[PDB]
Amino acid sequence: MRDLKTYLSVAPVLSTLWFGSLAGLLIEINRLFPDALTFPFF
Amino acid sequence: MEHTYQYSWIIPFIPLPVPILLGVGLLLFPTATKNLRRMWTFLSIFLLSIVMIFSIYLSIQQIFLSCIHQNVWSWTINNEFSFEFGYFIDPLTSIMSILITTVGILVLIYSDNYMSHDQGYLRFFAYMGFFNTSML
Amino acid sequence: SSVCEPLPPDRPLWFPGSSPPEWLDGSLPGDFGFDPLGLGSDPDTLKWFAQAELIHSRWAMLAVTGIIIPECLERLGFIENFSWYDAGSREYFADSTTLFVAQMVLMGWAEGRRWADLIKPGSVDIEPKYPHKVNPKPDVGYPGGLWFDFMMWGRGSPEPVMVLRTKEIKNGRLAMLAFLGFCFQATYTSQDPIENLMAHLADPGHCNVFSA
Amino acid sequence: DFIGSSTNLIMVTSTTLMLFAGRFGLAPGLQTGDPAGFTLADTLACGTVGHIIGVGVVLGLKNIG
Amino acid sequence: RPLWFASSQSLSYLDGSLPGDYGFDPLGLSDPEGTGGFIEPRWLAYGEIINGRFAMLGAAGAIAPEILGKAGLIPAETALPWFQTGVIPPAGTYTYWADNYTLFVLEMALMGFAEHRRLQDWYNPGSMGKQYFLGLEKGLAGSGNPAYPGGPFFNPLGFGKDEKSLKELKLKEVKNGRLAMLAILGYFIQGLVTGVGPYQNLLDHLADPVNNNVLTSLK
Numbered sequence: 290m291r292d293l294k295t296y297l298s299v300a301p302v303l304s305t306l307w308f309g310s311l312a313g314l315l316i317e318i319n320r321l322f323p324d325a326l327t328f329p330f331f
Numbered sequence: 332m333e334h335t336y337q338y339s340w341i342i343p344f345i346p347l348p349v350p351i352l353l354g355v356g357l358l359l360f361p362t363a364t365k366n367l368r369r370m371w372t373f374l375s376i377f378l379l380s381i382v383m384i385f386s387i388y389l390s391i392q393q394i395f396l397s398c399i400h401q402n403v404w405s406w407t408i409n410n411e412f413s414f415e416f417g418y419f420i421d422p423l424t425s426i427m428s429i430l431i432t433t434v435g436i437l438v439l440i441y442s443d444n445y446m447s448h449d450q451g452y453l454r455f456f457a458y459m460g461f462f463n464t465s466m467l
Numbered sequence: 468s469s470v471c472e473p474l475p476p477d478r479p480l481w482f483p484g485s486s487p488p489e490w491l492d493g494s495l496p497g498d499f500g501f502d503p504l505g506l507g508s509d510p511d512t513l514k515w516f517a518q519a520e521l522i523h524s525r526w527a528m529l530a531v532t533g534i535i536i537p538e539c540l541e542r543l544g545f546i547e548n549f550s551w552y553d554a555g556s557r558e559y560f561a562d563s564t565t566l567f568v569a570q571m572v573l574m575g576w577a578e579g580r581r582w583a584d585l586i587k588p589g590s591v592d593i594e595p596k597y598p599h600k601v602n603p604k605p606d607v608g609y610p611g612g613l614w615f616d617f618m619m620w621g622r623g624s625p626e627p628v629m630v631l632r633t634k635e636i637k638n639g640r641l642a643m644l645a646f647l648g649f650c651f652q653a654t655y656t657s658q659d660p661i662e663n664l665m666a667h668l669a670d671p672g673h674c675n676v677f678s679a
Numbered sequence: 680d681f682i683g684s685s686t687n688l689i690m691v692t693s694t695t696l697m698l699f700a701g702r703f704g705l706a707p708g709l710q711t712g713d714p715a716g717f718t719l720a721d722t723l724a725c726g727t728v729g730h731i732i733g734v735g736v737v738l739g740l741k742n743i744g
Numbered sequence: 745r746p747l748w749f750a751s752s753q754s755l756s757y758l759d760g761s762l763p764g765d766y767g768f769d770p771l772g773l774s775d776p777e778g779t780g781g782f783i784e785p786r787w788l789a790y791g792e793i794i795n796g797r798f799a800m801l802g803a804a805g806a807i808a809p810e811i812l813g814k815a816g817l818i819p820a821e822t823a824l825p826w827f828q829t830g831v832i833p834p835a836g837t838y839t840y841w842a843d844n845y846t847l848f849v850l851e852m853a854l855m856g857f858a859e860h861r862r863l864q865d866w867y868n869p870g871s872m873g874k875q876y877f878l879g880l881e882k883g884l885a886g887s888g889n890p891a892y893p894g895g896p897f898f899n900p901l902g903f904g905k906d907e908k909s910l911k912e913l914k915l916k917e918v919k920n921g922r923l924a925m926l927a928i929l930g931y932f933i934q935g936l937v938t939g940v941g942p943y944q945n946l947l948d949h950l951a952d953p954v955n956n957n958v959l960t961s962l963k
């Protein structure tokens with residue numbers, strides 16, 4: 290869709306998409322590996 | 332074994348209806364069925380593919396299970412005939428069935444282009460499908 | 468003979484009497500002007516969406532086949548305990564996770580070759596060359612080829628190429644919707660598609676979605 | 680309701696007296712066949728106001744007396 | 745020229761150009777200047793005609809199962825009022841060959857094919873005779889007016905070949921349709937205020953007209 294990809298390219302729409310994806314990533318990581326205080330995998 | 336040999340009577344009769352439709356098509360409406368020129372080709376190839384898959388399935392059951400099925404019906408019952416037309420599934424049946432079907436499918440894929448510049452097209456595939464019917 | 472001639476402007480539309488959009492002139496197969504939202508405005512993206520529709524429809528067609536035909540064989544007495552929406556949970560070898568990564572490897576090769584076709588058409592060419600023989604340059608999504616057009620039906624042998632591609636696309640849109648029906652009515656009935664068909668054909672009035 | 684009662688009489692007379700006060704009286708397009716104005720809007724207006732007066736007086740009479 | 749509660753502005757667009765131009769627009773709905781959406785003097789004419797036709801079908805199909813049912817001519821099972829037929833499941837329900845929601849999907853699909861076509865004929869009238877609708881689009885093309893298409897399918901007989909008879913028939917149509925719309929309003933309000941059928945209301949008012957309308961809000 291022309292000019293919708295330009296709107297979704299705009300800084301707030303793109304920032305909310307990036308930070309929603311990133312926050313879901315961090316959230317699911319903390320579900321998978323909750324309560325982390327060390328990196329023991331070396 | 333329980334429900335797959337009772338439907339072993341179709342593997343002669345599955346190629347049959349496209350030579351039946353060509354034998355009433357070319358003999359009655361030649362412009363019509365020759366206007367449907369390449370469709371009966373793929374229909375014969377598809378019906379022989381059905382017979383190929385079913386013969387492969389019977390071959391898999393022959394190499395797994397050692398049994399012979401002799402699904403005979405009755406054909407004439409008047410006197411000493413009591414005739415049958417049944418279907419005898421030995422390993423020789425499996426070898427011969429895949430030997431017919433694979434070669435016939437490949438010759439039909441070949442014959443789509445071998446006859447593609449032939450005025451005689453559909454009666455050749457009627458002869459092909461009726462031959463595959465008869466040999467199976 | 469092999470030109471991919473489009474549909475005329477006075478073609479049948481999805482909504483008769485409506486104006487087809489200007490970005491659906493008819494170059495693509497199955498062009499009936501369906502665009503209430505207009506997701507195919509950018510033609511460089513409408514090409515990708517046409518390829519998307521084509522591959523989506525081909526996979527949906529193979530899938531609806533692999534759902535209904537084997538269920539017919541189960542009703543005939545060939546396959547045991549068949550249920551497509553429980554045929555991933557049931558047992559095989561390779562745990563269904565080794566199968567997944569082997570699938571991703573092999574389909575990654577295949578769909579990556581297709582991707583390289585999409586990005587740049589002549590990169591991954593097949594149907595090997597022959598002396599004094601000019602293999603025709605194909606289109607994206609319809610490679611032709613010795614492997615995908617061995618009967619030579621794509622260049623327009625039995626029927627024209629446009630009507631055959633339209634046949635592919637229409638039959639496949641119908642298959643896409645059939646698979647959506649599979650994915651929905653196998654979870655809101657927890658039953659078999661062919662069983663649902665025979666159940667609705669028993670009493671079409673009261674055996675509908677509103678019973679459940 | 681119960682035509683002839685007090686609740687009917689002192690409501691009918693209020694409605695008709697307001698229609699009169701709008702027709703020939705001090706109270707006040709839509710061309711009616713009426714000699715001098717008093718359109719459908721004015722008719723409904725006087726009926727509404729006469730019903731206001733009627734409700735007021737019947738309930739002031741039901742409160743006391 | 746007969747004017748029923750005409751106004752100063754209503755005699756600026758309802759001159760004679762519509763069936764039933766009695767000039768009754770006191771509120772000022774069909775004013776042509778400053779229009780849009782569905783408040784248009786053409787769309788409102790179309791809406792009058794269509795709600796009147798559907799109301800005529802409603803009026804002579806909602807009391808018909810009770811005009812007959814209290815005189816024989818049908819089973820008493822298929823002799824319910826307009827509201828005890830499944831259209832008010834709180835008030836009543838009949839069991840047809842399908843459940844009521846399958847019948848609603850039927851209504852929706854069949855009327856969708858019947859009325860989206862009508863709508864696209866409202867937008868561009870030349871359409872509905874150009875797409876292959878099983879060849880029966882030959883009769884669905886001729887529109888002229890949008891509300892009065894008049895083709896082989898909807899107007900098989902002439903019934904208004906001349907413009908005098910057609911004008912008189914259009915007037916009769918809109919007047920019987922307004923009467924039927926008022927009748928449907930009476931049906932709804934009577935079923936709401938009594939809970940019985942409209943024919944029961946007629947028989948109760950005719951025979952011994954006692955408590956004709958005195959039963960205000962009582963079932």
Ligand code: CLA
Nearest residue numbers: 311314315316317318319320321322323324325326327328
């Ligand atoms: C700046 C100060 C600071 C610091 C150092 C920390 C540090 C931490 N906090 Mg605290 N916190 C802070 C501020 C801070 N926080 C603030 C301001 C708040 C309020 C908003 C909180 C609220 C808070 C809560 C409520 C919780 C924490 C938790 C944690 C722990 C995170 C564990 C986790 O999920 O990471 C895991 C690691 C990641 C998410 C990073 C993954 C990155 C991706 C996957 C890429 C990495 C791979 C990459 C490709 C490279 C590979 C190498 C090669 C192969 C290529 C960690 C000890 C959590 C915890 O466990 O408590 C101790 C927890 O529950 N914090």
Ligand code: CLA
Nearest residue numbers: 495496497498499500501506507516517519520523640643
């Ligand atoms: C994978 C899905 C898919 C994709 C990508 C396309 C892509 C395309 N179609 Mg096809 N089509 C599909 C499925 C798809 N179609 C199916 C299933 C039908 C039958 C219902 C049709 C019927 C159809 C017609 C009749 C026509 C097209 C046309 C087009 C083109 C323009 C529209 C566009 O860009 O939409 C892009 C679409 C998407 C990106 C997918 C939509 C994804 C969003 C998120 C919505 C998904 C939710 C959906 C509404 C759920 C269904 C709910 C259920 C109750 C029905 C384009 C090539 C027109 C054309 O020129 O043909 C070539 C045309 O006339 N399509």
Ligand SMILES: CC1=C(/C=C/C(C)=C/C=C/C(C)=C/C=C/C=C(C)/C=C/C=C(C)/C=C/C2=C(C)CCCC2(C)C)C(C)(C)CCC1
Nearest residue numbers: 694695698713722723724725726727728730731732734735
């Ligand atoms: C002269 C004459 C005439 C007439 C007369 C008369 C006598 C009339 C009457 C009329 C009437 C008689 C009317 C009425 C009306 C009414 C109304 C319009 C009402 C309203 C109401 C309301 C609005 C209500 C409200 C309320 C309520 C609900 C309760 C609460 C409170 C209140 C009150 C607020 C004519 C034309 C025939 C002709 C000539 C002769």
